[PDB]
Amino acid sequence: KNPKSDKFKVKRFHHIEFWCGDATNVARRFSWGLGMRFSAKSDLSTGNMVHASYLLTSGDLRFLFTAPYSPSLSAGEIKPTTTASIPSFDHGSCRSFFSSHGLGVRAVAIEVEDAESAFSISVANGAIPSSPPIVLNEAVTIAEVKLYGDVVLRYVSYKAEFLPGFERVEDASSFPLDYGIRRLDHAVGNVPELGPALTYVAGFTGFHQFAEFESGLNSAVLASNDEMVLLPINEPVHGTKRKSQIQTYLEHNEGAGLQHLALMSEDIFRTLREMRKRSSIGGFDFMPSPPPTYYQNLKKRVGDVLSDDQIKECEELGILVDRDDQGTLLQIFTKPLGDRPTIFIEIIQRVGCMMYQSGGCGGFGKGNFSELFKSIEEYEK
C-alpha cells in the first residue's frame, strides 16, 4: 500500500554533502576509490572566501565535499555581502559538526518543485528549521530542515549548473573515471529511538512507510510518492550477545547521524572489480566476504534469476544477494569511509519490478543477516 501522501512535490535525490576538515583530500580519495569525476568547484579560485566545496559526479550521483577556510579571510563579510556559494554554511557549525562526529554527511539533498513551499509546508507540519529558503542568482532556491542528529534534509528547486557560484572544472583537471555507479538509491540514518524519528520525518514530509518482506536493529523505511526517495532509519536492539552495530555507531558518532549511502550501479560486477582493484592503493575496503556455504546456498534461493556463472561471479567479488516477492537485490558493503566506525557505503543493483524500474525493487537485504549467520555456522561445521 502506497497512500501517496507527500505534502509537496518531490522529484529525486539531488546530492549528498560531506562536511570535512580538508575537502581536497577527501574528494580526491573518494574520486579514485569510487570512480567519480571532478565536476564543479567553489573555492578561493572562484571568489569564495568562506568555504572550499568540490563536487564529484558519477551518472546522476552527486557527492559534495565542503570544508571551512580560516574565518579571517571573510571577517569583514556579513550574510548580505557573503562570498559563500552555499548560504547555509557556517564556520562554527561546520567545525563543531566535524569535531563531534568526524567525517560524515551533513546534508541529504532532494530536488523538489519549490524549495520555499517545501520548507514552509515542512515547518508548518513540525519540521525544525535549519536554514530558511534563499534564492541564488534568481535561479535556484535552497532551504534546510533538521532530519536527525546534525543531518539536514536539504530542498533544492530550479527555475529552469550545480549551484550558482560553482564553476565547471577545467577538463584537464577532470579525468573521466567511471566504475558504473549511476545514482543514490537510499540514505540511512541511525537513531537512539526509531518511533519518534519516524513520526517526526513522516510528519513533516508525508512520506509513507515502505512495505518490507533478531540481530542488531529495528528499522523502517520512509518513501516518497513514487518511492524513488527512500530514507530508512535504524535503532539499536539492546541486551543481545553480540553488541549492536547501531549502538557502536551512536557511541563513536556522538549520537544520531547518517549510517550508510547505497549507490546504484548499472553493472555491479564491473563496479566491484574496479573498486576492489583499488582497495589497497587509496580506495575503499570491503567487509569480509561470506563463506562459500553462502554461495552454495544461493542456487536454491536465486537460481532462477542468476546463472551458475553469475553466481560464481558474485562469489569472486563477495556480493550478497537477497530477494523480495517482486525483485532481487545484489549488494555489498564497504568498511567505514573514515577513521571512525560510523559511515560506510553500500553498492547495489536491483533486478525485476519492470513497468522503468520501481523503487526499492528487492528490498534492502534484511534477509541477508540471517543468511550470513547460517552460512557462517554451516561453514564452521
Ligand X SMILES: Cc1c(C(=O)C2=C(O)CCCC2=O)ccc2c1c(=O)n(Cc1ccc(F)cc1)c(=O)n2C
- Residues forming the annotated binding site for Fe cation? 186, 260, 346
Is residue 185 within 8 A of residue 62, CB to CB? The reply is no
CB within 8 A of 260, min separation 6: which ones?
187, 188, 333, 343, 344, 345, 346
Of 172 and 354, the one with the shorter C-beta distance to its own copies is 172
Dist CA 335 CA 66 (whole Å): 22
**Interaction between residue 346 and ligand X (CB under 6 A):** yes
- Indicate the burial class of 115 (C-beta count within 10 angstroms; 0-12, 13-18, 19 or more): buried
Of 133 and 365, the one with the shorter C-beta distance to ligand X is 365
**Interaction between residue 234 and ligand X (CB under 6 A):** yes
Dist CA 90 CA 96 (whole Å): 10
Over the window 252 to 291, marking each residue x when it contacts ligand X by CB under 6 A and - when it does not, the resulting string is --------x-x------------------------x----
**Buried (b) or exposed (e) across 68-105, using 16+ Cβ within 10 A?**
bbeeeebeeeeeeeebbbbbbbbeebbeebbeebbbbb
Of 153 and 233, the one with the shorter C-beta distance to Co ion is 233
* Phi, psi for 119 (deg, rounded to 5): -65, -50
Size of the site for its own copies (CB under 8 A): 47
Distance set, CA 7 to CA 107, 119, 144, 190, 258 (Å)? 20, 11, 16, 24, 24
Is residue 66 within 8 A of residue 109, CB to CB? The reply is no
Q: Which of 300, 308, 298, 355 is nearest to 329 (CA)?
A: 298
Over the window 48 to 77, marking each residue x when it contacts its own copies by CB under 8 A and - when it does not, the resulting string is ----x--------------x-xx-xx----
User: 282 touches which of ligand X, Co ion, its own copies, none (CB within 5 to 8 A by kind)?
Assistant: its own copies
Residue with cell 563513536: 252
Of 52 and 156, the one with the shorter C-beta distance to its own copies is 52
Dist CA 188 CA 209 (whole Å): 14
Show binding-site residues. Answer: 186, 260, 346
Question: Which region among 200-208, 274-282, 323-331, 345-353 touches its own copies (by CB under 8 A)?
Answer: 274-282
Of 48 and 224, the one with the shorter C-beta distance to Co ion is 224
**Interaction between residue 172 and its own copies (CB under 8 A):** yes
User: 199 touches which of ligand X, its own copies, Co ion, none (CB within 5 to 8 A by kind)?
Assistant: none
Taking the complex as a whole, the smallest distance from the CB of residue 380 to its own copies amounts, in Å, to: 22
Distance set, CA 185 to CA 60, 343, 359 (Å)? 11, 16, 8
Q: How does DSSP assign 347-361, residue by residue?
A: EEEEEE-B--BPTTT
Taking the complex as a whole, the smallest distance from the CB of residue 188 to its own copies amounts, in Å, to: 21
User: 100 touches which of Co ion, its own copies, ligand X, none (CB within 5 to 8 A by kind)?
Assistant: its own copies
Taking the complex as a whole, the smallest distance from the CB of residue 97 to Co ion amounts, in Å, to: 23
Q: Residue numbers of the site for ligand X (CB under 6 A)?
A: 186, 188, 219, 232, 234, 245, 260, 262, 287, 333, 346, 364-366, 368-369, 372
Q: Residue numbers of the site for its own copies (CB under 8 A)?
A: 20-26, 28-33, 38, 43-44, 52, 67, 69-70, 72-73, 95, 98-100, 102-103, 172-175, 177, 251-254, 280-283, 285, 337-341
